[PDB]
Structures are given as structure tokens and as C-alpha cells.
Amino acid sequence: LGTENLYFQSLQPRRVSFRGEASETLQSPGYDPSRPESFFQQSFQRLSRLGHGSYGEVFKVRSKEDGRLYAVKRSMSPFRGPKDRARKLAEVGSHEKVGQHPCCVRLEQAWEEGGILYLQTELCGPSLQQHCEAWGASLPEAQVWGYLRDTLLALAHLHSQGLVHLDVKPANIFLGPRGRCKLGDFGLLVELGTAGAGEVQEGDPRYMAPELLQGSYGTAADVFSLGLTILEVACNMELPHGGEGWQQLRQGYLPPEFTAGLSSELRSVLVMMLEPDPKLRATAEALLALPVLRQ
Ligand SMILES: CNC(=O)c1nn(C)c2c1C(C)(C)Cc1cnc(Nc3ccc(N4CCN(C)CC4)cc3)nc1-2
Q: What residues does ATP bind to?
């Protein structure tokens, strides 16, 4: 990748896909390629900004094609070059590899224009982080068990295919109707056994599995991250980025000032998920087999 001819070469949208229909031309009611506005500008009603960061922005939109609501994630600035472009496009690939699942945020379509990547997904509710902020307290365990089960279902789906999300956290879990949720943000997702060697994009340090400090990547890392995710939302407990507390949470410590009110059942499951040794840590499939996590 770091050596292509025409390294610097950079107008109308091109579909990004699983090599099915695409590579392809896009069309839409409201879109005329000879007008200078982008496909995104012409083909959607932009309703609000749902999120933003160094990556770009996510908008709530209404599609002019079907009049339905979606989210569109748009990258910040034109591709830096071939490696940046490949890195960003790989998020679409990760969706293709994951495939559709009721506990994963669904990708509807993706395209690039003018060096910008656009991912149009289903519109979900707020993140679990945002939900906890609105609640202003610990979530009732009845809510927690549902979110735990749904995100475990998502992880089992990824893990069965040798995929690791690597950034499981409340901010990347989105609420659905009637108590469900979905795992999203596949930007850091990796397929084990494929380079880059030291497949090095790092998730949020608050939720990182301890074995990742020595580069031991595996599906078990996601189970640990989800354990801390659920601990945080069930206890309204801020997680340390580092220091003594960060180490203790990775040595089996459950702070009594925060966790004394957990049911024995939920505590028991969290201990399984937070096991420091990834070889001993429960798998998502194994957790989902526990009667307490049944349908
Ligand atoms: C890197 N970022 C993302 O992947 C990402 N961020 N958001 C906010 C979304 C994504 C996805 C996973 C790519 C797609 C998506 C799909 N749906 C939502 N829904 C949503 C709804 C409401 C809100 N809020 C409403 C109240 N507000 C003050 C803003 C937060 C945030 C997100 N968010 C998103």
C-alpha cells in the first residue's frame, strides 16, 4: 500500500461494497450529477447531527429515495492517501464480513465522493452511554440483563467468524425499541489472522482487555470490554483510564462502594467476563448458554 504509482491522484459518487452490485454508479430522486452539490447533499434531507469526532460526523437524515430515516456517517476530510483510504473503506468491508444480524447496526449502503467516505446505516436510538447520562443513575438490572444479552448475541456472531470488535463500550452500543440494543461502530474491527501484523488500532483504554497491553489479540478481549461496559452501566461507575484503579479492575477487583448492590447472579456473570487471563475468560457462546441469560 505505501508505494503506489499515481500516489497523489485524487468527482461523482462511487458505491463502496462487498463486490456484489458494485463498484457502481449512484442514483436518487433529487440527485443530478451535473449539479455541483454532492450526492449526500442532493439525495438526503439533513435533519440533525447525531455525533461527531476526529473521524467526522454522523447525521440523522431522511432519504429522498424512500422517505425513511437513516444515519449517515461522513468522514472529516478527503483521504490522506491510499493507506488512509484503505483503512476507512475497511469499515465497509467489516460490515460485509459481519453480515446482517438483529443485534448489530445494519449498513444500508456506502459510497465515496470527493475523497469523503459515507456510511448510511439504519437509524438507532441513543448510545447506552447517552441513555445512562439521561437516567442520571445506575440502570435497573432488568434493563441491564437485556443489554448484556443483546450485546453478547452480537459478539457471538462476530466471534464465530474470527472477528474482534476491539472497541466495545457504552458509546458504541445503540438502543433499539422495547428494551433492545445493537452493537455498532465497526471501525476498529479486525479479522484475526490477517495483517496488518500487530493489527494496531487501539480501543478506548478504559475498557481495554489487560492482555492487549502485550499485543495478545483475540475474541476474549471483547468479552472483557463488555464486562466493564456492563459494570459501568449497572453501577453508574466511572472507569479509570489508568493508574491503580485501572490495574485493580484487571486483577479481579470489584469496588465495593459501587458494586455492593449488584445481584449475586449479575455479579457472578461479570466475574466470568472480567477474568484477567484470556484463556480462562468465558466465551460469549458459553455465557449465552447460562440459564440466567436465556431468551
Ligand atoms: C464513530 N461513530 C459512529 O459509529 C456513530 N456515532 N453515532 C452517533 C452513530 C454511529 C453509527 C453506529 C455509525 C450509526 C448510528 C445510528 N444511529 C444513531 N442514533 C442516535 C440517536 C440519537 C442520539 N442522540 C440524541 C440526543 N442527542 C442530544 C444526540 C445524541 C445519538 C445517536 N447513532 C449512530
A: 50-58, 73
- Which numbered atom of ligand 1 lies nearest the CA of 55? 1
CB-based contact 39:110 (threshold 8 Å): no
Please indicate whether residue 167 is annotated as part of the active site: yes
Quote the CA–CA distance of 232 and 75 in Å, as a whole number.
30
Ligand 1 touching residue 124 (CB < 6 A): yes
Three-class SS of residue 179? coil
Does residue 71 line the site of ligand 1, with CB under 6 A? yes
Region of residue 207 (phi > 0: left; psi between -120 and 50: alpha; otherwise: beta): alpha
CB of 121 closer than 6 A to ligand 1? yes
Alpha-carbon dihedral sign for residues 56, 58, 62, 65: positive
Residue owning grid cell 462476530: 158
DSSP 183-219: E---TT-EETT-SSSS------TTT--GGGGGT---T
- The technique is X-ray
Sorted by sequence, the CB contacts under 8 Å of residue 278 that are 6+ apart come out as 209, 211, 216, 218, 220, 221, 224
Ligand 1 atom 20, closest CA: 126
**What are 174's strand-pairing partners?**
127, 182
This PDB structure is determined at a resolution in Å of 1.7
Would you say 1 and 86 are in contact if contact means Cβ atoms under 8 Å apart?
A: yes
